[PDB]
Ligand binder design. Structure first.
Ligand code: HEM
Length: 468
């Protein structure tokens, strides 16, 4: 019972129940819980995930202090979440100095140059997705976005970490894809995780039995797959394709360095885990918005048609040049910041601009809630891209709008993700128009689970701009 911590500090929040803390209030999902707390408690509030104290903060300066100012010193790590095994070394699960070192070895791998050089590969799959989407529409039936983008997301992943070039969508059974496919984002509200939240003392027991949240079935497979291609393939030299693995392999081969072949395997897997369902979900939200806002869709199409007359293949610089595109992407991320919350564990007693935060408390920034906070957004529930226009985006506080988090521990694949999604969006809109379908849910309703996603999958009628 650390359940008295918050009233002891005079910090408001919902009253916790023995053992459960406040988890039954998650019956409508993390985001609804955070919006309702924001509303009734104010700028700061506390709650308990089992016995774990969580202090939500909403003040921009405090957020910067936590995410930026005091990253290395006090708020360096995310909260532990369950049995992880060797993945304990994935950069996103790694802690303190261990994390700092991994954050160095990997920086170069995510530089624009390395990125630009990966465009041809990803772009190549944009052609594949279009080629693919061409059929699904050409046919007649509504298209289920998660699937088309799931495959596209998959294809970019494999391809950008050694030439495993597969048309994932039409090779549903290619084992290598049938495994990477299983690397889905965790729903921390499913029974298992709720149980570990209420019985955290069970994690060491699962670790000793080698029980891991990532499917060993799949982790084993890729561990071995990387092993061979890391040898078998390029252990022949002469001709390499600037993918993450190679960047990880070569980074290996000539301060703190030397990525353990196991670490490297951990990185490759986490990069997949970090980008697979995230990219696909964001693309789907965007397409939903464009379909329910024809005018925006058209305008986007006109800009694309302008920067690339007559379906001209997208390019790094060409992508960067499109502003309405950038505005549409950003607006969608404001409405659907898929991480939902940003978190940091307080490694030690501290005071940040006024309030004292005890050691061990989890400091949480409710992105979903700050993104829809009336106090900062006119008609928060509305999809209005102008919000991010050139002469308007300056009024946006970066500690309020945080779809990719902020500070030293922000999303390391952010630019890659933005690039990936735009290239895809360009290719697709540069060929089709998505319109609401009779089965299209409007307004879109969000799941009540622990992931930010539509209640029912988004399906839309897809039409080719002059397809005969
Ligand atoms: C639209 C897609 C994506 C979104 C919205 C997104 C979101 C985020 C967010 C909000 C964080 C937490 C930041 C923080 O705590 O301050 C994060 C972490 C991170 N992201 Fe992404 N991400 C996306 C895709 C990617 C992709 C494609 C990759 C990999 C190439 C990637 C790699 C990671 C990693 C490794 C971390 C952990 C970084 C660290 O702790 O040092 N993400 N992401």
């Amino acid at each position: 019972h650390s359940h008295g911590l918050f009233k002891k500090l005079g910090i408001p929040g919902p009253t916790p129940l023995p053992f459960l803390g406040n988890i039954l209030s998650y019956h409508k999902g993390f985001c609804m819980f955070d919006m309702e707390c924001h509303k009734k408690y104010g700028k700061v509030w506390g709650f308990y995930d089992g016995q774990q104290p969580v202090l939500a903060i909403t003040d921009p300066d405090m957020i910067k202090t936590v995410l930026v100012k005091e990253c290395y010193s006090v708020f360096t790590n995310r909260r532990p979440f369950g049995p992880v095994g060797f993945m304990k070394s994935a950069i996103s699960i790694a802690e303190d100095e261990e994390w700092k070192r991994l954050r160095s070895l990997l920086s170069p791998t995510f530089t624009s140059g390395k990125l630009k050089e990966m465009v041809p590969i990803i772009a190549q799959y944009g052609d594949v997705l279009v080629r693919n989407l061409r059929r699904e529409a050409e046919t007649g039936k509504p298209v289920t976005l998660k699937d088309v983008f799931g495959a596209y997301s998959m294809d970019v992943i494999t391809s950008t970490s050694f030439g495993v070039n597969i048309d994932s969508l039409n090779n549903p059974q290619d084992p290598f894809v049938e495994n990477t496919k299983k690397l889905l984002r965790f729903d921390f509200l499913d029974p298992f995780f709720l149980s570990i939240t209420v019985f955290p003392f069970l994690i060491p027991i699962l670790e000793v039995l080698n029980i891991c949240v990532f499917p060993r079935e799949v982790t084993n497979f890729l561990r071995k797959s990387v092993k061979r291609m890391k040898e078998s393939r390029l252990e022949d030299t002469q001709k390499h394709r600037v993918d993450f693995l190679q960047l990880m392999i070569d980074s290996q081969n000539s301060s703190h360095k030397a990525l353990s072949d196991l670490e490297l395997v951990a990185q490759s897997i986490i990069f997949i885990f970090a980008g697979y369902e995230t990219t696909s979900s964001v693309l789907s939200f965007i397409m939903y918005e464009l379909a329910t806002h024809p005018d925006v869709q058209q305008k986007l199409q006109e800009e694309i048609d302008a920067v690339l007359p007559n379906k001209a293949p997208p390019t790094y610089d060409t992508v960067l040049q499109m502003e309405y595109l950038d505005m549409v992407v950003n607006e969608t991320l404001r409405l659907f910041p898929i991480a939902m919350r940003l978190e940091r564990v307080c490694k030690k007693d501290v005071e940040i601009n006024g309030m004292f935060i005890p050691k061990g408390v989890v400091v949480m920034i409710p992105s979903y809630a700050l993104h829809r906070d009336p106090k900062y957004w006119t008609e928060p529930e509305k999809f209005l891209p102008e919000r991010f226009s050139k002469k308007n985006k300056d009024n946006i506080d970066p500690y309020i709008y945080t779809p990719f988090g902020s500070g030293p521990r922000n999303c390391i694949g952010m630019r890659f993700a933005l690039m990936n999604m735009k290239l895809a969006l360009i290719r697709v809109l540069q060929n089709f128009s998505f319109k609401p379908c009779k089965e299209t849910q409007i307004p879109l309703k969000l799941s009540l689970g622990g992931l930010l996603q539509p209640e029912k999958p988004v399906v839309l009628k897809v039409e080719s701009r002059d397809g005969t």
